[PDB]
Structure formats: structure tokens, C-alpha cells
């Protein structure tokens with residue numbers, strides 16, 4: 001399907017390259033196992049990055065009162 005809450009993301013960034021490579025710059029509370037390497041700053045609320053690359057962009061599910 002496509003209505004899946006596997007990941008949400010408000011800011012993807014696909015690279016200028018050949019072939020391309022893409023990733024969600026918009027960091028979250030939850031880091032999903034969709035990307036292989038989840039790293040997290042132990043902040044409050046914590047921030048957490050897909051270090052590992054992807055070739056997809058997920059729809060927006062609005063995290064915090066900013067975006």
C-alpha cells in the first residue's frame with residue numbers, strides 16, 4: 001500500500017548526483033527501521049537521524065508547532 005505509518009517526513013533532500021541518493025533532513029523523536037542506521041542526539045525532545053541513505057520520500061505528518 002501507500003497509507004503506511006512506516007515513516008513520516010516533513011523535509012526530504014534528494015542529492016544532485018548521478019545516480020541520485022536521498023534522505024530525510026527533518027529529524028524526529030522516532031527513528032524507524034526503514035533506514036538502517038538510526039543515530040540520535042540525547043536531547044529533549046531527542047533528535048534522531050537516518051544516517052543511512054534511502055531512495056524514497058515519505059509524506060508529511062507534522063511533528064512540532066513549527067512545521
Ligand SMILES: [Cl-]
Nearest residue numbers: 001002003004
Ligand atoms: Cl502497506
Ligand SMILES: [Cl-]
Nearest residue numbers: 003059060061
Ligand atoms: Cl495521514
Ligand SMILES: [Cl-]
Nearest residue numbers: 014015016017
Ligand atoms: Cl541545480
Ligand SMILES: [Cl-]
Nearest residue numbers: 024025026049
Ligand atoms: Cl543532515
Ligand SMILES: [Cl-]
Nearest residue numbers: 028029030063
Ligand atoms: Cl515521530
Ligand SMILES: [Cl-]
Nearest residue numbers: 006031032033
Ligand atoms: Cl518502525
Ligand SMILES: [Cl-]
Nearest residue numbers: 034035050054
Ligand atoms: Cl527513510
Ligand SMILES: [Cl-]
Nearest residue numbers: 036037038052
Ligand atoms: Cl547497523
Ligand SMILES: [Cl-]
Nearest residue numbers: 041042043044
Ligand atoms: Cl550535552
Ligand SMILES: [Cl-]
Nearest residue numbers: 053054055056
Ligand atoms: Cl532504501
Ligand SMILES: [Cl-]
Nearest residue numbers: 060061062063
Ligand atoms: Cl499532521
